[PDB]
Design a protein around this ligand. Structure first.
Ligand SMILES: NC(=O)C1=CN([C@@H]2O[C@H](COP(=O)(O)OP(=O)(O)OC[C@H]3O[C@@H](n4cnc5c(N)ncnc54)[C@H](OP(=O)(O)O)[C@@H]3O)[C@@H](O)[C@H]2O)C=CC1
Length: 317
């Protein structure tokens, strides 16, 4: 009943992550046990681990805790009352979201409501890299009601959510403006960005010629606040980081502009859709580095720089 898993005993720097022997998750009669093949990293992982996030509030008196929500793998055990999944099925989805992060591990417990069948053409690494980043990109674009003709500014275009959002926005027929390092300019142009603003070189507002219909703000804080000034009268900002969502919405209200937060929800139909695109080479998931669980500290140090292009992923098997 043992497995290897990454845990942390205290909130702190990346060094607090440990590869630990731990029991296999318990599963209820309506849940399943999954042998994990792949699990991707998201910033929420390091914000929880350093204790800054809202999820850290709930785990405060409940450590040690695992980490990770995105996973890919094989169904090994099934509860008595699970009807539509079979043992041996290859699956992809989210586990333990939000209060029981657990995917940096060899086995996870999951509900059939938070997984789908992995398409055959998808690799396990691709399948584990998609759920959080992809569902967020899509639901942000939908919250902004992006249509063909619209101008869309996507901050942090080279990252996990961004690089997908750019591709999805291009496929919607929108003019895509984005912010990134000079180093990522060529990468983002190739994915469909019309303009890549080097945000180190000048105020990004100065680089934007005309009022924008939507801002997909993936940085938040003062960048999100600043983005309000480039919106059209009818434009809206979707500020995705949760910690400054309220602040950004308030300043938008004061500027008489529409603003939204975003809380990623699991959607079977959307993830089916995103996965199909990836299998048909119509949407690229950029996996910039593949780690073993043994390298979790290193992985988290890289992720916390805030300069990861695309996705980092653990190959568990
Ligand atoms: N509320 C929700 O349901 C969700 C919220 N999120 C949140 O959204 C945010 C982004 O997520 P994710 O895409 O995974 O993050 P990433 O770590 O993958 O994003 C890294 C990217 O950010 C860019 N970047 C860093 N600083 C700036 C800046 N000041 N201006 C413009 N770009 C910048 C970098 O570009 P470069 O190297 O070129 O400088 C890099 O490519 C996170 O804070 C995350 O917690 C994510 C998923 C769901």
């Amino acid at each position: 009943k043992e497995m290897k898993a990454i845990q942390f005993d205290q909130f702190g720097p990346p060094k607090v992550l440990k590869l630990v022997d731990t029991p296999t998750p318990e599963y209820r009669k309506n849940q399943m046990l999954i042998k994990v093949h792949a699990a991707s990293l998201n910033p929420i992982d390091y914000k929880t681990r350093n204790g800054s996030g809202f999820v850290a509030k709930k785990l405060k008196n409940n450590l040690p805790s695992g980490l990770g929500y995105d996973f890919s793998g094989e169904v090994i055990e099934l509860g008595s009352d699970v009807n539509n999944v079979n043992i041996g099925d290859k699956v992809m989805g989210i586990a333990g979201f939000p209060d029981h992060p657990c995917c940096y591990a060899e086995y996870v417990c999951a509900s059939p409501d938070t997984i789908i069948q992995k398409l055959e053409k998808l690799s396990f690494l691709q399948a584990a890299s998609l759920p959080t980043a992809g569902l967020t990109a899509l639901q942000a674009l939908n919250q902004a009601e992006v249509k063909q003709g619209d101008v869309v500014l996507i901050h942090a275009g080279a990252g996990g959510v961004g690089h997908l959002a750019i591709q999805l926005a291009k496929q919607k027929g929108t003019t895509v403006i984005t912010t990134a390092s000079k180093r990522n300019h060529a990468f983002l142009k190739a994915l469909g960005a019309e303009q890549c603003i080097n945000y180190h070189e000048e105020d990004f507002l100065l680089a934007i010629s005309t009022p924008v219909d939507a801002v997909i703000d993936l940085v938040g804080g003062d960048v999100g606040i600043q983005s309000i000034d480039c919106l059209k009268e009818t434009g809206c900002i979707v500020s995705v980081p949760t910690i400054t969502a309220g602040r950004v919405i308030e300043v938008a209200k004061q500027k008489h502009r529409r603003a939204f937060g975003l809380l990623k929800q699991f959607n079977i139909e959307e993830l089916h859709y995103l996965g199909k695109l990836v299998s048909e080479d119509k949407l690229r998931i950029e996996i910039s580095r593949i780690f073993q669980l043994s390298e979790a500290v290193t992985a988290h140090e890289l992720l916390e720089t805030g300069h990861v292009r695309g996705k980092l992923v653990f190959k568990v098997r």
